[PDB]
Structures are given as C-alpha cells and as structure tokens.
C-alpha cells in the first residue's frame, strides 16, 4: 500500500504530467498561429505522449490500491517571443519534470518503498530521451536565427512526427 | 475572419470540451477505485472522444485565422455516492455542453456568421449521440439498483469500448 | 426531450411515411394487373425505401426519449386511368410529403429545436432526389402517350431497380 | 381463375398479413420505450417476415389472374401492462392468423380449388413455426416474472435476430 | 420549382464559378511565363475544381426543373506585379465568391426555399477550405519576399497537386 | 520563337477552343432541359475534349517561349428549334474550327515556321475525327425526324460516352 506522503506526491506528479500535455497544446496553438504546421504537429504529438505518461502514474496508483485525486490544471503561457524561446521554455519545463521525478525517487528511498522506486526507473530512463529530443531541436534553432530558409526546412523534417489520435478521431 | 465575440465564445467551448475530458477522467478514477474496470474503460474512452472534440474547435479557429487561448481547467468532482449518481452527473454534464452549443449556434445566427453555424452542425448532430449513449447506460442502472448480479454484467458488456490510445502509448 | 407539439408532429409524419409505402404498394398492385412487371418492380422497391424513411423518424423519437404512436393507415386508391396518371398521382404525393417536411422544419425553428431541424436536414436533401426520380419517369411517359413500343421499353429499363427484400424473404 | 368468394378472402388475408406487420411494429415501439432493444429488434424482424407473407398472397393473386385490393390498416394497440402481456397478445394474434388460414383452406375445399389449397400448404406448415417461436419466448417470461436478471439475459439472447432491411436502408 | 429570382441568381453564380476557372487559367498562364511550373500546375488543378463547382449548380438546376443560361465570361487580368500579388488577387477573389454564396443563402431564407439553402450548405462548408488553402500559400509568400531559395522550394512542394484531366486528355 | 502575327493567331485559336467547350456546355444545358440525358452526357464529354484542345495550344506557346492572352468568351446560343438543329449548329461550328486551323496552317507556311505547321498536323488529323463523329449522329437524326422511338434509342446508345471529370470531381 502507498503511504500518505507517497500517494500525495504521486498524485502531484500525475498533475504535472497533464499540465505538461496542456503546455505542449499551448505551444501547438502558438506554432500554428505562425503558420508552422510542422512545429505544431510536433507539439501535438508530444501532448499525446505526456497523456500517456499520466496514464502510467494512474495505473500504478490503482495497482498499489490508492486513489487518484485530480486538481485544477493552471493556465499555460500563451505566446513567446520567437520559436527559439518556445523551445527554451519547453526544455526548461523538461528539466522541471525531471527535477520532480528525482524528488519522487529520493522520497521512495527515504520511506524504503522498493516497489515505487522500481516504477520510477521507467520515468528516469525516459526523461533522458525527453531532454535530448528537445535539445536536438533547440540546437538546430540556435544554428539558424536569422535564416528563414533553414526554419522552413525544420518545419518539414519535424512534420514526420504526426499525432496518431486525430487519425482515430 | 472570426469576430471578437465569436472567437471568445469558440475559445470558451474549447475549454469546455477539455474539462469534459478531465471529468470523464475523474469518473474513470472513481470506477476503478470500486473495482469496476469496465466502467473505467468506458470513461477513459469517452475522455479521448472529448479531446477529439476540442481538436475540432482548434482546427476551426486556425482555418478561420483566429487564435486559441487556453485557460485553466478547474478541479473536477472526486467521488459520487454511487455508480448511478456518477452517470446522472455525466448526463447532466452532457446537457450542459449541448446548452452551450445551442448558445454558440444562436450566436452565429445573430452575427450572420454562416461558416460557423455550418461548423456547429457537426456538434449539434453529435450531441444527440452523446446524450443517448449515456441515457442508455443510465437507464440500465435504474433497472438494477439493489442487484449486484446485473451490475457485474454491465461491467463486462461496457468493457467492449476500450481506449485505443494506451495501445499506442 | 421532444415537446408535445413536436412529438405529435413527428408521429404524424411517421404515419405519412408508412402511408407512402402503402400507396406505392397499391401502384405495384396496379401495374402488375396491366402486366407491367417492370413498373411493378419499380414501385415495390419504392415501398421499401419509404419503410426505411419511417424507421428514421422511429429511431429519432427513441433517441430523443419520446414515444411512437401508430394510427390507422387509410385505404389507398385502387385504380388510375392510365400509367401516366399513376405517376402524376405519385408525384403529387411526393409534393405532399415535402410540403409536410417543410412544416416540420418550420415548426422546429419556431420552438427553437436545433436537434430536430438538424435531423430534418436529411429528409430535405432526400426529397429532392424523390421528386426528381419520379419527374424523370413522368416526363418519359408524356414523351410516349400513343406509343406502346416505348412503354414496352420503359418496362424493361425500370426493371433494373429490383426489391432486395424478397431476395431475403 | 379465382372465384369472387376466394379472391375476396385471399385479399382479406393479405390485409391480415400487413396488420400483423403493423402490430409487431407497435410492439417494437413498446419494447424500445422500456429500453429493451433486443426485444425491439426481435419484433422488427418479425414485422419484416410478415411483410414477406403478404408478398406471397400478392404474387399468388397475380399468378392466378386476380386483382389485389388494399383496405385500411387499423390502429394497433399502443401499450401493454408488461413484456409478458405483449407476448400473450402476440401469441393470441398468431392463433387468430392460423384460425383464418384454416378458414381459407376449408374454403378452397368447398369450392374444389385444388391450386389454392396447394398454395395454403405453405402457410399451414409455416404457422406451426410461428406459434412455436412465440410460445418458446412466452414460456421463458413465465419462468421469470419477478427476476430482472433473467429478463436482462433474454434481451441479449433475442438480439441475435436482427432485421436485415435497415442494413440495406 | 425554382422561382424567377432564385433561378436567375443560381445562374449568376454558375457564371461566377466558370469565371473562377477562367481566372485560375490566367494565373497558370502567368506562373508558367515566369518558369514556375509548380505554381502553374497548382493553378490548373484549381481551374478544374472550379469547373466541378459549376457542374453542381448545373445539376441542381436540372434537379429542380429549371433552365441554365450561359452569359459571356469576361476578360481575366493578364499579369500581376509579383507571385505574391497573384495570390492576394486569388484570395480577394475567393472572398468575392463567398460573399455571393452568402447572398444566395440569405436569398433562399427570404423566399423560404429550404431545398436550396440545404444545397448551398455544401458550398458554405467548401469555401472554408478554399479560403484557407490559398491563405496557407499566401502566408508562405510573405514569409519569403526577397528569398529566391524558398520560392524555388515552394514551386516543388506545390507541384504535388497535379491536374488529372491532361492525364485523360 | 513565335512571331507577333503567329503568337496572336495561336492565341485567337486558344480562345476558339474554349468557346467550343462553352458551346458544347450550352447544348448539354439544352438537351438536359428536354430530358435527353444521353445527348447531354455526349455534349459534356465533348466540352472536356475541347478543353484538352486548348491545353495543347497552351503548352505549345510555353514550349516556344510565348505568352498566352485570354480574352472574353462570348455568350453561346441558348436554345435551338430541335435536337436536329442543335447538331447542324455543332457541325457548322466544327467546320468553322477547321476553317481556322487551315488559316493557321496557311499562316505558318507563309512565315516559314516549320515547327508550328508540324504542330498543327495533330489538329488537322483530329478535326477529321471531329467532323465525322458529329456527321454520324447528324445523319441518324435525319433518319428519324417524326419517330420518337428511334430518338429514345439514340439517347441510350450515345450515353456510353460519359464524362470522366465528374467522376474525379
């Protein structure tokens, strides 16, 4: 069974994995205002990955006989100054998610909860792919700041990641 | 182009189609606490339909050269008294969504916006299927109030509706 | 929910879509008395389309939580003077059905019933095909009034429309 | 050729095979008001069998060089007290159809009409299947009068008989 | 039947859907003078869509028993100052077509013509795709005004839309 | 390169190959008023052949580094006295097209333009098929002037030529 301090902190992180998806849906509503429908299709596909991260804390709380509480999801930022700053704010956010998985994992070792630190092993290994898949694109945008020719070619090459959920809906 | 009173009211309804999906995810977190994993798989599949409803207001605002603003999604109710009251509160919610589509459609006729009232024709025809797909199950639960044998058989027959997004995630 | 004046008028039109099928079955009993078994197979296939029109008012009343009342279907006319007058009386009947769909659609706009006027949109678009599929054949019979050679060739070309229900029964 | 007393009595029975189908469509409008959409899909499929019975008297009158006259189809009963009494009134009706086939068959032997008594041999052999397919379900409802668990399981097992005409319309 | 004021206004719009196709054939004769054979293959494929729009007013007038009158198609503009101004003049033209569909749809509601306003529902839903498929390309040309590298890459990516009629002719 | 007198005369003939298609679309709007939907489907398929003739002068002017100018297409005749006179006016028109190809071909030999007279060799060989495909049908209508039985059988046999563009649009 989950203790009161670990069930509350797994519920706070399930709220952060849904505010993540409600932030990558406020960036896709920003890039598709600029006409960058390959950046916007990159961000929507990341807002469906992050829903799949919150259905893993959800299925873990009901495997360990807990109870999921849903709080309010706050207002995400609307606009950024440039498509560079919209990825420096998505990479600063992925270092805020990982900072809070490491304080879940340092919480499960204090309470001697071996079946939770075994579960956070998936999210520690997967945030290494999340920080690097954004730092790749963030370094292609510092490679082209006053060059619309390259930004036109980043829109197309990132359009290979298309969301699969509108194909079902 | 969308007027200021119609772009604001299409943005308020995109917030209601995402609070819908954040309400059917607070019912799936209720039925899966009772051990009713067929009611909980019904509700998660409805929380992925309602995300697909908010990606239609989203793609309409960027077809009509607007701008999507995302507000905060409030706290949904946690627990209900019974699995009957958890569907009387999902049917009262589907009569609140439809009350606000009819005040979008009575707004687009006041502003003489023929390309928006043509778009809400999909959501008027589809809320007739949403109010009836809940009133079917709500009438099977008033048919069995002190009968766990039938509630055990509603859990299995509603488990045919499984969410397709965990199969991709 | 359907109001008392709209549930009564949807029930009157479900009685007209079954008297339609009981009129095209009194024309098929007329053309097959003259030996015109291609005109008679045209009319029986229209009496199975019109049953399919009354199973759409029927499924709409039980989607909107109503109650279908069945009145008596009156006696259709037995004989007409010619196979021309048996289509001038089927085209005058298809202008009587459409006159009553337009008084359902002008009733749903008076009561501000957006989910019924959305439903009658199918029957407004489909009576345009019904008035034209009879006016085609009615204009081929004014093209041949004292010519049995052409009436022998309208019997065969209209025999391509065969009823599918005797193939199952 | 058909005599005047046998053409009139074959036309009266073609009116009873269409009031049959307009009675099983007033029971399907009753069971689908109670939410029993497997009883209602049983009754609609019987209202398409009984139309196929009246297209056999119809094709026999035009094989024997007669003339089909269509009278008015009266008002069927609207509601019954229970789903038991809605099958005791469909079994009392199938003993009224068979009572009138036996008075057609005792009419064709009085007029020495061997080609009509040969034709009613199909309807005598088929009403034995009609009285027994209703007495099966009528005896499953006297087996469960104060048991909604079994009535919930008769709704599903009778839903295997689905009408084929809405699949074409 | 179509009234004299609605048959005249449906005939004026069939003349505008053929002057549309005779304008997108004067832009394809402009882009293929500049050597932009991907812009020119985009415009020819739009001049075959707009012929398909005038064969829908044509088939509607002969479903409603009218008469199509063909007036003269005026001289389209020959040259524009740039490939930007050749899309600002095709987007100003698609806001002139839609302004005249909305004055057909506001004409069919004044004459209480429900079967014409039901037909213009296709053209209201489809001009939303026409104004947006031009505003996409018009915003890619304001993204590159003094950049021939990007205009060379818009010629190729718009060459995926090839006209199907020279493949048959 | 094309001279000024040959570029102007190739542009005048591209205007005649589009007024041809706007004449066979005023005959299809005449035959489909008489209910002759096989004559009307013959004429629409000829109005798509003649568009394919004007896309050959168009692709030749941009192979020879010219410039296509589009003038106005005048009003075609609305009605003729009979379906005989609607083919005597389409055969008199096909002798007016061929009279002007022969004055293009006698113009390219005066200017010693061997690459244009080589191109008009296709249109000289193809107008022999156009004058004969109309003179076949024109001689079947002088074979039946007071015979609606044969005119009913010319409508069906000419309906094998169906336009392929509405199948794509």
Residue numbers in the entry:
A (entry chain A), B (entry chain A), C (entry chain A), D (entry chain A), E (entry chain A), F (entry chain A): 1 to 169
List sentences quoted exactly from the publication behind this structure:
We show that a nanofluidic sample support with well-defined geometry can be used to prepare cryo-EM specimens with reproducible ice thickness from picoliter sample volumes. The sample solution is contained in electron-transparent nanochannels that provide uniform thickness gradients without further optimisation and eliminate the potentially destructive air-water interface. We demonstrate the performance of this device by high-resolution 3D structure determination of three protein model systems, apoferritin, T20S proteasome, and tobacco mosaic virus. To validate the suitability of cryoChips for 3D structure determination, we collected datasets for three test specimen (P. furiosus ferritin (ApoFtn, 480 kDa, O), T. acidophilum 20 S proteasome (T20S, 700 kDa, D7) and tobacco mosaic virus (TMV, 37 MDa, helical)) that we selected for differences in size, shape and symmetry.
